[PDB]
Amino acid sequence: SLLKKLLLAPAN
Amino acid sequence: HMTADLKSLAKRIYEAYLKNFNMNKVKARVILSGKASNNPPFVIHDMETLCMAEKTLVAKLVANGIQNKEAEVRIFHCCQCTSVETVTELTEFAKAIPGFANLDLNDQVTLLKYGVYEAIFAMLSSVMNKDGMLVAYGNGFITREFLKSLRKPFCDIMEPKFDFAMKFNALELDDSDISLFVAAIICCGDRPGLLNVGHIEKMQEGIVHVLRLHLQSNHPDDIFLFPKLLQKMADLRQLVTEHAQLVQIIKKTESDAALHPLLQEIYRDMY
Ligand SMILES: CC(C)(CCCCCC(O)CCCCCC(C)(C)C(=O)O)C(=O)O
User: Which of B25, B13, B54 is nearest to B168 (CA)?
Assistant: First the structure.
């Protein structure tokens, strides 16, 4: 899931 | 009066909003007002001025293979580029909401899937006036009438968003209000397929409690502003339902209007 990838990314 | 935990929640949400969204309402209303600069945004009001603006964006258009598509499709794909950006910002904003990152990951996906376009159209109102909308980080302005002049079905995309925005903007919200409103939209316990409904409802209750108290303090003369905004949340759900239907028509009837994969995932089996 592309949404899951965004959700799992480390804080910027 | 807000206790400390509630003040802290509202501050973290407002700070997250300011950090994550490039365009916000104070900036938009400076540009739209013309009172801080005599150099207004470039106005896209017809096909000639669209092509002119597109000369600046040639590198992006060629990179995505759309430079030779029909004007309406070029516009549609540039709209997608802005939506994908905003979904990305909204995901970071959501992770800054206390409690959100602790939800089951599938519930986080569900909240974003159904919430992002409600939030997008609420925030879009900030860059809209009755005559058009800011684009490209406030550097251009595309006219409402130009958007209506595009061929069907593309002329049907933005006009219902302008309609919503003119009513929403009359509420005169500021960024502190909108940040809590957007948090409430994302933290909605009524979405289809949510697993841990009761827990998400308690999260939303806290945010909506802060929203209500904040509105009573920030807009004391608009006594029922909070109920008005609850109604706007329902209007937004309907706005997005209709929007998804139109997006489905475009996918089934417009061979050149490929959806970016992230947006494809959002719309898939949505409504
Ligand atoms: C494309 C223009 C004419 C102006 C920049 C577009 C700005 C996008 C706005 O935020 C509206 C977003 C509406 C929904 C889009 C859609 C793809 C249908 C979706 O995401 O569902 C240019 O300058 O070339």
Answer: B25
